[PDB]
Amino acid sequence: FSIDEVSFRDLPGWGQDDPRKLFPAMATILSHLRNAKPYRTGALGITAAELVSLLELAERGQVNSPEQARQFFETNSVPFRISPSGFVTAFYEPELEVSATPDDVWRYPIYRRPPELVDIDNDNRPDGFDPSYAFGKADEEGISYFPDRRAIDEGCLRGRGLEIAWARSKVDLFFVHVQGAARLVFPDGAIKRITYAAKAGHVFSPIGRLLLDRGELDPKTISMQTIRQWLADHPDEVDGVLWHNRSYIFFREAGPIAAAKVPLVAGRALAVDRLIHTFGLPFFIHAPTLTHLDDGKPFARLMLALDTGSAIVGPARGDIFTGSGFEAGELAGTVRNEADFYILLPRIAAERYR
Known part of the structure; x- marks a missing residue:
């Protein structure tokens, strides 16, 4: 340029x-x-x-x-x-409705950065590790790739006290990952702000492009609104589409x-x-x-x-x-x-x- x-x-x-x-x-x-x-x-x-x-x-x-x-x-x-x-x-x-307590409705956790999610540089990058990755998983065996969005959504971080709060909409929470920040509003009116702290390490994949490529949406009209409508109209297909984005965002309170x-x-x-x-x-x-x-x-x-x-x-x-x-x-x-x-x-x- x-x-x-x-x-x-x-x-x-x-x-x-x-x-x-x-x-x-x-x-x-x-x-x-x-x-x-x-x-x-x-x-x-x-x-x-x-x-x-x-x-x-x-x-x-x-x-x-x-x-x-x-x-x-x-x-x-x-x-x-x-x-x-x-x-x-x-x-x-975005403003995102949450609860401090999980149940059948408030079921989608929002996570802080796990202590095993380490920054990667020359000092710790294992042989053969993708040099574009900025984060990895520290384990007994050295460093490995951190689980992806699907593995996290399927529960690999549960029971560790890593949750900031629980959302009731998986799509609304997905879009918070995309924006990189949110105002969390609790049922008692309390507000907490969260912002990007780290990420699993995987590349970001845009779901809009996936939907265009599959002929699900019109390129002349595509917007956040039409993407959200498509997802609202296809609940059984939502996970497959969201999980195409292997990147997963971890947050801190700000x-x-x-x-x-x-x-x-x-x-x-x-x-x-x-x-x-x-x-x-x-x-x-x-x-x-x-x-x-x-x-x-x-x-x-x-x-x-x-x-x-x-x-x-x-x-x-x-x-x-x-x-x-x-x-x-x-x-x-x-x-x-x-x-x-x-x-x-x-x-x-x-x-x-x-």
């Missing part, structure tokens, strides 16, 4: 965007980077230290209007069009915290390809066919790269965070739109790309 310098005049709708919510988000990133290991430098090449230079300028400033907010970026960053067109989908934090280790901001956080991009950088996203997140107007806004996902692959691929709960989910479920991606580089970093 290529990235090419443009002017802020070239960013359609830039002049009409109000990026004020990015300033508290940038403050959370700066706080994090001052007390944690730095973000991985993306293949594009912007370092966390280069990002910090922009974050520190924001810290020093005072923004008190949409115009002052835009001016901050115009003064302190340089925009570049990313050329692979780009493509956006959306994600959200917008939700995500891969950039800071809370997401509804409508302003973007998930990006973790190999290519560095977290925390601003992206201006222009998706003129996407109108239902702007009350009929085209989507054109500055966002921060604050998460990643297995399905998010490519230099101009993104997942827009729509927020938390039911309506956020309805909004997210149909996002599937062409988009132009522009990255804003801190001005010291920008020179080598010019």
Whole structure:
């Protein structure tokens, strides 16, 4: 792919965007980077230290209007069009009904990370282990592959006190694995937030593609909503389809915290390809066919790269965070739109790309 310098005049709708919510988000990133290991430098090449230079300028400033907010970026960053067109989908934090006590209704456990689910690197990777696996099972025999979604759903983790709570819908819980976070609501009104902690290690397989490939759904209409309808209409076939996704997500109690280790901001956080991009950088996203997140107007806004996902692959691929709960989910479920991606580089970093 290529990235090419443009002017802020070239960013359609830039002049009409109000990026004020990015300033508290940038403050959370700066706080994090001052007390944690730095973000991985993306293949594009912007370092966390280069990002910090922009974050520190924001810290020093005072923004008190949409115009002052835009001016901050115009003064302190340089925009570049990313050329692979780009493509956006959306994600959200679902609300999931749960119980602290299992029974015939509340039957689907939500698990914390098992102590035998170890990170893998050179120090412990066994001979012949798939070098793409980031997790494995520590046993007496060394390290082996961790069980897959099917084996876990069939009960291999039971009776160990690993459950956070029990859900009553396997499909709703599946979609929580896909989103990577949830707000758990208990029958007494208590709320617990959970977010990704680790995973079994297996590749993610999208069930939407499985259903399209099998001719079960129409590619012209496919959405979260039609996938959920198909699954609701085929209860006896649900396990076979869900278990095609061998990946299984383990959670911890904690917008939700995500891969950039800071809370997401509804409508302003973007998930990006973790190999290519560095977290925390601003992206201006222009998706003129996407109108239902702007009350009929085209989507054109500055966002921060604050998460990643297995399905998010490519230099101009993104997942827009729509927020938390039911309506956020309805909004997210149909996002599937062409988009132009522009990255804003801190001005010291920008020179080598010019």
